[PDB]
Amino acid sequence: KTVTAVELLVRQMEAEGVSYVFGIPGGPLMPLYEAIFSRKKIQPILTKHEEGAAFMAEGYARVSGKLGVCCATTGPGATNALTGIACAYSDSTPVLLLTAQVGTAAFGKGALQESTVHGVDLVSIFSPITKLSVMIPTAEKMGEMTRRALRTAQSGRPGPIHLNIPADIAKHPVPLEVFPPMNYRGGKPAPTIMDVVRVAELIFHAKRPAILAGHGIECAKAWEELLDFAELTGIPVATTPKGKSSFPENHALSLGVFGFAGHQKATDYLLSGDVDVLIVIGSSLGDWQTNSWDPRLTPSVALIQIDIDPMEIGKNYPVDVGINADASETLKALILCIRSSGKGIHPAMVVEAMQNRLPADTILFVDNGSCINWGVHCYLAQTPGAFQIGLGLAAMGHAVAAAIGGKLAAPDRPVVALVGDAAFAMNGMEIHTAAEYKIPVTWIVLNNGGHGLVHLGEQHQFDSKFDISSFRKSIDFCKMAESLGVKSYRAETVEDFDAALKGALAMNTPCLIDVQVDIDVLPPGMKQRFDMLNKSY
Amino acid sequence: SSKTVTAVELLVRQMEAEGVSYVFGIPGGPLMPLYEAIFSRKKIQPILTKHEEGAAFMAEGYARVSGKLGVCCATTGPGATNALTGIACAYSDSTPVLLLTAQVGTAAFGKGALQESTVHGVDLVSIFSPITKLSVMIPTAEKMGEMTRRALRTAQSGRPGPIHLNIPADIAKHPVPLEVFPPMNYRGGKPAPTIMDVVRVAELIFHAKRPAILAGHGIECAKAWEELLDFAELTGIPVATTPKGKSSFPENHALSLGVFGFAGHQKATDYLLSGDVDVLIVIGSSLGDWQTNSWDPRLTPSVALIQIDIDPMEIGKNYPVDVGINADASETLKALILCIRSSGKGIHPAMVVEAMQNRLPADTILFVDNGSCINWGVHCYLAQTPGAFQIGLGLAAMGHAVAAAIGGKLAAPDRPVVALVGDAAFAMNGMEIHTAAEYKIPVTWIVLNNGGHGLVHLGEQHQFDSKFDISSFRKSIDFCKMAESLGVKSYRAETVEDFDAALKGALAMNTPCLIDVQVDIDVLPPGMKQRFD
Ligand SMILES: Nc1ncnc2c1ncn2[C@@H]1O[C@H](COP(=O)(O)OP(=O)(O)O)[C@@H](O)[C@H]1O
Ligand SMILES: Nc1ncnc2c1ncn2[C@@H]1O[C@H](COP(=O)(O)OP(=O)(O)O)[C@@H](O)[C@H]1O
Ligand SMILES: Cc1ncc(C[n+]2csc(CCOP(=O)(O)OP(=O)(O)O)c2C)c(N)n1
Numbered sequence A: 001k002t003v004t005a006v007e008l009l010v011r012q013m014e015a016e017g018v019s020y021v022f023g024i025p026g027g028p029l030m031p032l033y034e035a036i037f038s039r040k041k042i043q044p045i046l047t048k049h050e051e052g053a054a055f056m057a058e059g060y061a062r063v064s065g066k067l068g069v070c071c072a073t074t075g076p077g078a079t080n081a082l083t084g085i086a087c088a089y090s091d092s093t094p095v096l097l098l099t100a101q102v103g104t105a106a107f108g109k110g111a112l113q114e115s116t117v118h119g120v121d122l123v124s125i126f127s128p129i130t131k132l133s134v135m136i137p138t139a140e141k142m143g144e145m146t147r148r149a150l151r152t153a154q155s156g157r158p159g160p161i162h163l164n165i166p167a168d169i170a171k172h173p174v175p176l177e178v179f180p181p182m183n184y185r186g187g188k189p190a191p192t193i194m195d196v197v198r199v200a201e202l203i204f205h206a207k208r209p210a211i212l213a214g215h216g217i218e219c220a221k222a223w224e225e226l227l228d229f230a231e232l233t234g235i236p237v238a239t240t241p242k243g244k245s246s247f248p249e250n251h252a253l254s255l256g257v258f259g260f261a262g263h264q265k266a267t268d269y270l271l272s273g274d275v276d277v278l279i280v281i282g283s284s285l286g287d288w289q290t291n292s293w294d295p296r297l298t299p300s301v302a303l304i305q306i307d308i309d310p311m312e313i314g315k316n317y318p319v320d321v322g323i324n325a326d327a328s329e330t331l332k333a334l335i336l337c338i339r340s341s342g343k344g345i346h347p348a349m350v351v352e353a354m355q356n357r358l359p360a361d362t363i364l365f366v367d368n369g370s371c372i373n374w375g376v377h378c379y380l381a382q383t384p385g386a387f388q389i390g391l392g393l394a395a396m397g398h399a400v401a402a403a404i405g406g407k408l409a410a411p412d413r414p415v416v417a418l419v420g421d422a423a424f425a426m427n428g429m430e431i432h433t434a435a436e437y438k439i440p441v442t443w444i445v446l447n448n449g450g451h452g453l454v455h456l457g458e459q460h461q462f463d464s465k466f467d468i469s470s471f472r473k474s475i476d477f478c479k480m481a482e483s484l485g486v487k488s489y490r491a492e493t494v495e496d497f498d499a500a501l502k503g504a505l506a507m508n509t510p511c512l513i514d515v516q517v518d519i520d521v522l523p524p525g526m527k528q529r530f531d532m533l534n535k536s537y
Numbered sequence B: 001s002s003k004t005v006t007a008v009e010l011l012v013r014q015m016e017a018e019g020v021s022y023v024f025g026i027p028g029g030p031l032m033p034l035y036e037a038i039f040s041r042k043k044i045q046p047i048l049t050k051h052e053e054g055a056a057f058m059a060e061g062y063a064r065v066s067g068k069l070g071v072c073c074a075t076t077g078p079g080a081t082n083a084l085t086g087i088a089c090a091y092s093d094s095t096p097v098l099l100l101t102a103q104v105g106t107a108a109f110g111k112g113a114l115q116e117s118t119v120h121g122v123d124l125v126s127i128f129s130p131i132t133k134l135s136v137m138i139p140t141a142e143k144m145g146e147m148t149r150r151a152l153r154t155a156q157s158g159r160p161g162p163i164h165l166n167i168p169a170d171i172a173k174h175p176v177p178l179e180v181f182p183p184m185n186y187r188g189g190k191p192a193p194t195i196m197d198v199v200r201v202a203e204l205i206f207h208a209k210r211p212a213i214l215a216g217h218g219i220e221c222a223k224a225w226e227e228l229l230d231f232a233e234l235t236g237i238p239v240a241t242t243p244k245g246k247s248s249f250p251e252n253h254a255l256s257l258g259v260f261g262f263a264g265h266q267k268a269t270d271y272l273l274s275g276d277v278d279v280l281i282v283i284g285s286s287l288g289d290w291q292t293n294s295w296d297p298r299l300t301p302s303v304a305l306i307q308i309d310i311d312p313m314e315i316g317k318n319y320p321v322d323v324g325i326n327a328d329a330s331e332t333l334k335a336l337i338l339c340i341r342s343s344g345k346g347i348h349p350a351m352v353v354e355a356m357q358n359r360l361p362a363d364t365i366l367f368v369d370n371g372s373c374i375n376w377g378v379h380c381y382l383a384q385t386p387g388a389f390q391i392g393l394g395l396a397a398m399g400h401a402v403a404a405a406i407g408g409k410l411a412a413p414d415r416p417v418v419a420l421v422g423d424a425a426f427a428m429n430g431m432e433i434h435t436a437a438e439y440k441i442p443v444t445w446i447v448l449n450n451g452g453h454g455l456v457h458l459g460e461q462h463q464f465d466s467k468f469d470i471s472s473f474r475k476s477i478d479f480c481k482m483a484e485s486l487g488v489k490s491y492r493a494e495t496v497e498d499f500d501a502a503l504k505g506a507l508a509m510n511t512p513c514l515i516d517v518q519v520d521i522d523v524l525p526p527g528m529k530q531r532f533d
């Protein structure tokens, strides 16, 4: 039994549990769509921009805990996706990007949108921000290369893949051989028994232990192991900003967010100098995770760092126990050992009204801009994985589009995106996509008529000497939503906002809420933060 | 002991000496010192766009219309990666565009800096290396001047192309000696043909029984329009253009064969593929797919193929040459003229284009996006004015013209600028019309609204027997309401009378305007039928 190479690719994605392929067609890509529509299993989602498709696949992957897939044509289709894939790379999200390539017979002749070394070399452009970027050389190799891509994306530190597919091989016949995922990728690494024993001993004798949980908790699906571990030991848990929702913030052991826009309670605990044993789980300990590598984060007695990526361990802080292992496998081992032992509207008011009306199981997507500060600082995240923020690359527009992918991954749950107006101008056209497929997402646009953080930067770092941040005329997002077939509310009082949010939650359609916001409002942690840029200059 | 300026102010001053007038982009923390220097100097004006891709497109459109360097800027990480498609288009169209990007401070390298853009994070220099002539990080403030001059010389020498300069945020404000140079001091002139090649070409022309010229986009790059015209008139040799080279030759001229290749004209096809052309002169064309009807062997002439190109790597690539001239097209045409003289010897889209032809002033610059608008514009619009037809066909990126048109208007503020674009392309970059509203840049967008991806829809019918639809929107976008949302006046046109009145209204306005034209998605555009094969 034979199938086209591209159908084999689609069938192998089927066995990984892939449900959607986000993208925009093109001539050389049409065999992929022909295969998808023939199989009636994976559903294609047409987006407005391939960057939006990459964002959506990234949002789908993070919420589903599965592989996200997007596709793009030769040349400018693929290059349009790059920012989204770079975000996936920075956030360790498994996203597979399928791109088309011209036929082999046209290499080096000036083919339309030629995407080889002789034209626009997509394989090379994507190499720095993917775990693997490769062109399928022959139809016979489609199988091996697809399994390689799927194994690479989801093994070790997860990350995106770029697979480039020449249009002439795509429909060549190949043996129909699909494998279950267990047969072509391996399991997760665990800690050694001696490392488990040594950590348990450090915990038993510690007089002021603490946990810093990062985004690796989501990557590892380690939420309930982390919660059980903390309750079993009494150890309080802080999270990184991106790590928000790894631990329930209404829990008695929750310190809140440590770092940028974080909570005084976490800062006091971890920088006091009193913590003797600090356990870092799944954080790369970059700038915003550490208040620019504050030396006071160093504990008194031992720093324990657990990471699946051995290159992150001991990078910025010397470690006393450095565990290279999956976070959930490490926490399980620790639990077992310890147990068997026996031993306009102010944005803060906006967030507050959201907290009072949003169901507990709401998945909140937050963009990049002042909404980082307001969401990270002012929103209480009780549900595991329910706070979705892209802080690895912090690309404007990420949350605007990724929330659509998130809703497709969790159709039973409310999905809300908190975004700025300039971010919405970058990728807000995608709400037309939500309208087209009736994907109920609510966008809350903090409409401050320009680039808030930039505006505040001009005031605090540049003496208000110039303005490259304020629009001379704010965008009317309700009219824009109307033009794209999405219901809208304008909110200028918190009462109007609450009525809009309550209408939007009930409606079963996409909806947009245009919130009037003062561009001069100083968001939490921003004041304390400008100095790093000043220090940099 | 001489006066010093910040490294970033040196960069601005050196750009001033190249005649740069605008910098298109979006600010970011690490990029702020560049904006401080620009506003300090009060000469180059910054243009805040909606998306960094829009900034790269506008720089490309500005460069192509001005004949000068276009400049855009983006912050670390995702600001820069958002510009990439526009820079890739400049690379494919041989357009000199300088992209300035920020980098984190060097003290943070390898530590997980915010939007870290090094080998340890998102490696901008590597990402951009394939689609720039030069991609480089300024290592030290002291190197700012040499690296900036190197970028400007690289962008505008040989075959023009884009440049990526990455600037660490700490370097940007370090003092450097105030050393600025005129462009002639750090880049050279253009290459000319040898006397022997000129004489051989003149001889081949004198003896040819059916000569022909195929003029490509290199004519615009070389600013060679008058020399081409005078050469054609002196010799009586008819001129076809490539699709992208459209407007390199006046199409109302008795010697014009029109466009050869994709969406081209039968008169050109008959003339060049008949088999009777004995001497073919190719000037500034890469002879890619659409330029040659997929490398049709019949294009080969009977007696001699003469190819003139500034890039030696293009000569003889797809067709064997008899005279391969590595030189600038303008210097080559001037030498040939001198030698020969001294010798002594909904609405149907065709009705939309027709109505445009009947109303656009003669000096209008027409930007055409990528989609079925390619076929309608290349085939049905008669371009009489040198360089007034702007289509990005090197990469043919959807949305290119939507944003590029704004750059073109800043480059030619006294001429009418009109963009012919599809609805899906406008969904991709149409937010930039807000930039035109903010800066009061009068461009007219003509959106061919057929409710989805027309070319893809036609490919489904003609190549996949209509087995699936991944092209038709369930609901059309309302571009009048969208334009209104962005503060741009708009018209909806369902009859050619509505369209004519709307175009007349847009032209008189002198503010930006959008015309939302109802178009049938089933219409087969010219030359598409002969394609899909
Ligand atoms: N399954 C896993 N188990 C443990 N650590 C992981 C796992 N998956 C990813 N990681 C690690 O988690 C870290 C996440 O870092 P990052 O995305 O910067 O988040 P944060 O902002 O919370 O530091 C990376 O060091 C990565 O190696
Ligand atoms: N000043 C110049 N003189 C001659 N040729 C040039 C000049 N500038 C660029 N070129 C050449 O013109 C060609 C343009 O090719 P391309 O952009 O593919 O347009 P077309 O679609 O008309 O072939 C390239 O071969 C390039 O080397
Ligand atoms: C693609 C991209 N370009 C630029 C930046 C730099 N940047 C960070 S915040 C900001 C302003 C965001 O404005 P808006 O979305 O309106 O948010 P606000 O700060 O006004 O709430 C910019 C440009 C970025 N993060 N991503």
Ligand SMILES: Cc1ncc(C[n+]2csc(CCOP(=O)(O)OP(=O)(O)O)c2C)c(N)n1
Binding pocket: A024, A025, A026, A027, A073, A076, A077, A080, B370, B371, B372, B373, B396, B397, B398, B421, B422, B423, B424, B425, B426, B448, B450, B452, B453, B454, B455, B456
């Ligand atoms: C960025 C990008 N993505 C995809 C393509 C492939 N492509 C070529 S034409 C086309 C459809 C264009 O639709 P629209 O702008 O509405 O024009 P129409 O064909 O309907 O007139 C697409 C997707 C492209 N050229 N550029």
Ligand SMILES: O=C(O)C(=O)Cc1ccc(O)cc1
Binding pocket: A453, A454, A456, A457, A458, A461, A533, B027, B028, B029, B030, B032, B075
């Ligand atoms: O954090 C960043 O890099 C931003 O993009 C926001 C910003 C912009 C300008 C400033 O002067 C300070 C901060």
Ligand SMILES: O=C(O)C(=O)Cc1ccc(O)cc1
Binding pocket: A025, A026, A027, A028, A030, A073, B455, B456, B458, B459, B460, B463, B532
């Ligand atoms: O020309 C291209 O490559 C396109 O992207 C438009 C297109 C899309 C699908 C087809 O089946 C044929 C043409």
Ligand SMILES: [Mg+2]
Binding pocket: A369, A420, A421, A422, A423, A446, A447, A448, A449, A450, A451, A452
């Ligand atoms: Mg804003």
Ligand SMILES: [Mg+2]
Binding pocket: B371, B422, B423, B424, B448, B449, B450, B451, B452, B453, B454
């Ligand atoms: Mg269309």
